[PDB]
Amino acid sequence: GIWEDEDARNFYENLIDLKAFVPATLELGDEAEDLTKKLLDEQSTGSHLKLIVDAFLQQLPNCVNRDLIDKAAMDFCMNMNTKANRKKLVRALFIVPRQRLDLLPFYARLVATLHPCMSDVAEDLCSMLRGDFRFHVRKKINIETKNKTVRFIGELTKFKMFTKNDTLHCLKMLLSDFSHHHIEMACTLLETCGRFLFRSPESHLRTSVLLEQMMRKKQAMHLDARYVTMVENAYYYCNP
């Protein structure tokens, strides 16, 4: 049993089969989202189409349930699919605000639902999310933005848009320099998709090794109490 509920099994595994359809100090989030937002802002059957796409993107933040987000996918796939439009979608998905963590699972569902008939949405978003992750792992920018990036990767992992091996590499990078911001990013990552990784047979053994290395490290490396407790809680959350 990989999932807790039956709602979870269905939210992550029962997607609408779209392939049945027609072939048709700084003023910042992070620097990555600011740069992406400015690319979006810079820019007549296409002026009508642009209009309906800008409507569509501006409505995404309201698709707060399973039925609403699946509809959005059908709407996009049937009236708006266009190289230029796929790039705008990817970029609107990537600049999700940190204050709407609740969107991440729906945004991941959209991406995974589109993937079988326009994979490049997944490819671009993942590539963007990977690069921002690398950036966060190198610096020391508010922990709350970093946690948005890591949560989004987690949701995408549960949908298999990131492979187990991808996200395990993320975790391994954070365990190499096990410092304050990296410990939290790690614990956020494991809260989001650690059980998926631990329970899945393909990833179980490597997750477990890494979980035990984190526990070994809280004692061994004398972290201050707050992070000792953080690591423990993420551990017992995956491996109770």
Numbering used by the authors: 457 to 480, 529 to 532, 534 to 548, 559 to 655, 658 to 757
Sentences from the paper on this structure:
The crystal structure of UPF2 MIF4G-2 (residues 455–757) shows that the core MIF4G fold of 10 antiparallel helices (residues 561–756) is preceded by an ∼100 amino acid region (residues 458–560) that contains additional elements essential for stability. The first part of this N-terminal region (458–478) folds into two short α-helices (hA and hB), which together with the connecting loops pack against helices h2, h4, h6 and h8. The interaction is mainly hydrophobic, involving Ile458, Trp459, Phe467 and Tyr468 of helix hA and Pro620, Phe621, Phe676 and Phe713 of h4, h6 and h8. Two salt bridges are also established between Glu460 and Arg712 and Arg716 on helix h8. Helix hB and its adjacent loops pack against helices h2 and h4 via hydrophobic interactions. Residues 481–558 following helix hB are largely disordered in the crystal structure (apart from the short helix hC) and indeed this region is highly variable between species. Similar to MIF4G-1, the N-terminal region stabilizes the interhelical packing of the MIF4G-2 domain helices. In fact, residues 458–478 are evolutionarily conserved within UPF2, and the expression of MIF4G-2/3 constructs lacking this capping region yields mostly insoluble protein. Notably, superposition of MIF4G-1 and MIF4G-2 shows that the capping helices hA and hB in the two domains pack against the same region of helices h2, h4, h6 and h8. We solved the structure of UPF2 MIF4G-1 and MIF4G-2 domains at 2.6 and 2.4 Å resolution, respectively, using SAD on seleno-methionine substituted protein crystals.
